[PDB]
């Protein structure tokens, strides 16, 4: 009974993009589902960030109390390629990261989703700023990465030497992609892929065949450019060992409950929710699972998008797997 339910407002991007839901609309939808933990994207739905004034932040505090919701997680971005022809200096990046540390401190959050591509070296240099705001840094682990990828392994080295409890991870359920996601495949065929070639690809995905064999194999059997792009998605979606989570539980601050499609059965159709949640229980996890709906970008060409409904089903499913 220690797993808590939350939602990343990223889940409602389609309605927000179209101005169908305001920011407060999104939080309101969240409490109506009993998802009181909030994960937010400042660069997405608070225009004027990083120049939000005390009037905004106090108002955010007042909103949280009205809905009984809790500001759990802030999701940072790092535009290292902001300047054409060069990358940011390490010193320029720390400044961008501190923006996000300050804002998360000012937002009432307890953890920041640090983008997966963030270097061990940048994490080390900004750690003192995190310490000053007692702010946790959770590195997102997303496909094709996993807790045993050498990039994460190198991060583990840094956190092992430094020994700070503010450094950690946010597993994203796309590293537990059990089947090739249906809504992706359906759009690929809509984009002109060979349905027979899609069927081979999906079959081979379940078999765990190396991505590069599948690429050449689809190539060799006469696949078109869309088929090739379909096959190459096997480099971007992976299964990983759910029991590996038990080894790192102290560093799992937060979880991206990514999902693409909840069917009429309150079942997620391609991700390994039924395997990961039992393990988190075995390990004593006491953080949040935050719905992170990404199906919108795949279905929007041919279907109306309903992120709220989709999140209602995901939240009902999370409750089921949690045991509430």
């Amino acid at each position: 009974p220690q797993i808590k339910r939350g939602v990343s407002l990223y889940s409602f991007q389609e309605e927000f993009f179209l101005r169908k839901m305001t920011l407060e609309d999104c939080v309101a939808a969240c409490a109506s589902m009993g998802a009181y933990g909030i994960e937010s994207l400042a660069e997405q739905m608070m225009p004027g960030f990083p120049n939000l004034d005390d009037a905004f932040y106090d108002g955010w505090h007042a909103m949280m109390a009205k809905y009984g919701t809790v500001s759990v997680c802030h999701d940072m971005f790092l535009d290292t390629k902001k300047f054409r022809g060069r990358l940011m200096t390490l010193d320029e990046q720390v400044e961008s990261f501190v923006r996000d540390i300050r804002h998360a401190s000012r937002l009432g959050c307890t953890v920041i989703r640090v983008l997966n591509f963030v270097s061990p070296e940048l994490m080390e240099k900004v750690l003192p700023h995190a310490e000053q705001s007692n702010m946790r840094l959770g590195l997102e682990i997303h496909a094709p990465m996993h807790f045993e990828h050498p990039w994460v392994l190198r991060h583990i080295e840094f956190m092992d030497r430094l020994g700070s409890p503010l450094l950690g991870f946010i597993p994203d359920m796309g590293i537990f992609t059990k089947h090739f996601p249906p809504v992706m495949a359906e759009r690929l065929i809509r984009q002109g892929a060979t349905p027979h070639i899609i069927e081979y690809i999906r079959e081979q995905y379940d078999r765990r065949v190396l991505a590069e064999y599948v690429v050449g194999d689809v190539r060799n059997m006469g696949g078109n450019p869309v088929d090739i792009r379909a096959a190459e998605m096997l480099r971007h979606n992976n299964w990983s060992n759910p029991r590996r989570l038990l080894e790192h539980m102290d560093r799992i601050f937060h979880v991206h409950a990514k999902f693409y499609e909840m069917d009429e059965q309150d079942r997620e159709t391609s991700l390994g929710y039924e395997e990961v949640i039992p393990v988190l229980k075995e390990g004593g996890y006491s953080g949040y699972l935050a719905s992170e709906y990404e199906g919108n970008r795949h279905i929007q060409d041919a279907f109306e998008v309903d992120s709220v409904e989709q999140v209602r089903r995901h939240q009902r499913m999370l409750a089921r797997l949690i045991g509430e």
């Binding site: 991007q13 927000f16 390629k81 929007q300």
Partner: protein, 125 residues
């Protein structure tokens, strides 16, 4: 991603020397204008060179060739920009085709991220 929403319906209007229309960015958060690495505009299939294009975000109008200097001018999430295209002749009334091809320099992504859209807009008076 958000491709079907790039070109905003009912927004084509005449200005001196060309036309303007509304454009949305096919990305899931606000992005500095400097990372709109390419924005290829076609009207009726004709390419409009980059020097004859301007982007207006809020109260700031910038020539497209100077977007590199707009590192902190943010294309906010869902915000419609008014794109002004300098054309070599006036556009007659009725419907016309408008195409936009984006390449976004996204820092955590290895190749230009792409989105494309085209819509038939009537020149509204």
């Amino acid at each position: 991603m958000f491709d079907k929403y790039i070109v905003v319906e009912d927004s084509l209007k005449r200005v001196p020397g060309g036309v303007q229309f509304g454009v949305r960015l096919p990305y899931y958060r606000g992005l500095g204008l400097s990372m709109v690495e390419t924005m290829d505009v076609t009207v009726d299939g004709e390419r409009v060179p980059e020097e004859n294009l301007t982007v207006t975000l809020g109260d700031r109008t910038v020539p497209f060739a100077r977007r590199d200097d707009e590192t902190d001018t943010i294309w906010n999430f869902g915000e419609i920009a008014t794109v002004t295209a300098r054309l070599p002749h006036e556009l007659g009334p009725g419907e016309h085709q408008v195409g936009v091809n984006f390449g976004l320099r996204i820092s955590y992504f290895p190749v230009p991220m792409v989105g494309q859209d085209a819509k038939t807009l009537k020149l509204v008076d």
